[PDB]
Amino acid sequence: DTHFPICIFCCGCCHRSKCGMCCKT
Amino acid sequence: DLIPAPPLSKVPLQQNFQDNQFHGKWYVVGLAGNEVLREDKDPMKMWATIYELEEDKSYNVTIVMPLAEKCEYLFQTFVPGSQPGEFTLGGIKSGPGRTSGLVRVVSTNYNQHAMVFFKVVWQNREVFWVTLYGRTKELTSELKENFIRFSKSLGLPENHIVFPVPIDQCID
Ligand SMILES: [Cl-]
Structure with a gap:
């Protein structure tokens, strides 16, 4: 069924020193 | 190496917070975070956050960032939390x-500056991070030094404190 990815805006998280959308894997 | 999030007691809320005066566009004049470093090979460029106040007192938030080949627009909803601001x-x-995430407007005079604390629970x-917001792209040394001291009081060393470069593209 539909996949609903869980994403948030973060400075850091999936990418150090960058700000953008990070999606939980 | 890991810098823990500070206790919420160390992140004040602006007293008598006026949500209808905090709306509109803010420039990110300063940024500090436990996972943000100053990057001399690719110095952060100024970005902007636009707060639209909704009837239910949520903000619809637009984040405008300058990328090499385009303007990026990201969207969030800030829903009223446990305290004003x-x-x-x-x-x-x-x-x-x-x-999940949290937002706390730590200090602001509405027509010139703010400091806002952000936290997220990411992969356990x-x-x-803390933004120093300006209504314009420049703020006084005094306000920047106050942002530095606040950032440090949350355990952030100096190389985790960034002043994005003023630019015109995307954010005007
Ligand atoms: Cl996405």
Whole structure:
């Protein structure tokens, strides 16, 4: 069924020193 | 190496917070975070956050960032949290396997500057940052030094404190 990815805006998280959308894997 | 999120007692809320005066566009004049470093090979460029106040007192938030080949626009919803000037992301509450966020307007005079604290629960750890917001792209040394001291009081060393480069593209 539909996949609903869980994403948030973060400075850091999936990418150090960058700000953008990070999606939980 | 990991810098823990500070206790919420160390992150004040602006007294008598006026949500209808905090709306509109703010420039990110300063940024500090436990996972943000100054990057001399690719120095952060100034970005902007636009707060639209809704009838239910949430903010619809637009983030404008300058990329090499385009303007990026990202969207969030800040829903009223546990105190005036505190918000959560998308109304999602703290929970033991769960992605969530917090926002706290720490200090502002509405027509010139603000400092805002952000935290998220990301892959079982807490990531936080503080923005120094300006209504213009420049603020006084005095306000920047206050941002530096506040950032340091949250355990952030100096190389985790960034002043994005003023630019015109995307953010005007
Ligand atoms: Cl996406």
